[model samples]
Target: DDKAACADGIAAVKARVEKLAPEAVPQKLKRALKIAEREQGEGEFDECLEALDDAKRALP
Candidate 1:
């Protein structure tokens, strides 16, 4: 429950931030992508998906 809630919060934050201007997308995406990659490497697909969801939401 806590973990899922955290993921949801992270997704929402990233989603809101992603609505910013296009120029800001790359840097944000980079950070988010790295997080996702790290989580994926750790075998956290569910977490990674949360991060990826954030990244995608962040796309302009």
Candidate 2:
């Protein structure tokens, strides 16, 4: 399922980012993470994944 895949992808990125830096992460990536959370809360995993992709790319 794309939704499931997206959810997992978001989670994976979140975990990876969090491990790298908890307080110094970029604002755009932070916004993406927030969007991903909101989208996941609404059962919109595709959108969550898209935001996760943004976050992943925003990583240093």
Candidate 3:
């Protein structure tokens, strides 16, 4: 579903973001979340929900 898509989308975004952020740890966090999703068998669904939460909290 969208979670898998979100996971993939975020990873792609992180790839480009890393080009700009350089020393940032978005990839690290993304990697960690990916592992977690796999361990939980949540995959994309969990990522979609969690990423939305992350985006919401990031808002000012």
The most accurate candidate by TM-score is 2
Tens-place lDDT digits, model 3, residues 1-60: 765666665566546545655455455555544554563365446555565455434322
Candidate 1 residue 37 C-alpha distance from true site, Å: 0.4
The per-model lDDT (C-alpha) reads 0.68, 0.83, 0.52
Q: Which pairs of residues have clashing backbones in candidate 1? A: none
Candidate 1 yields a Cα-based lDDT of 0.68
Identify the superior model by TM-score, candidate 1 or candidate 2: 2
Encode model 1's per-residue lDDT on 1-60: one tens digit a residue: 635554665566567666777576677776877787688667676787777766776566
Residue-level lDDT of model 2, residues 1-60, one tens digit each, is: 868887788778878887775677889988988998898889888888788889888899
**True lDDT of residue 49, candidate 2:** 79
Q: How should the candidates be ordered by TM-score, best one leading? A: 2, 1, 3
List TM-score per model, in order.
0.56, 0.79, 0.35
Each candidate's clash count: 0, 0, 2
Candidate 2, which ten residues in sequence have the lowest lDDT sum? Answer: 14-23
Pairwise TM-score winner, candidates 2 and 3: 2
**Cα miss at 40, model 2 (Å)?**
1.1
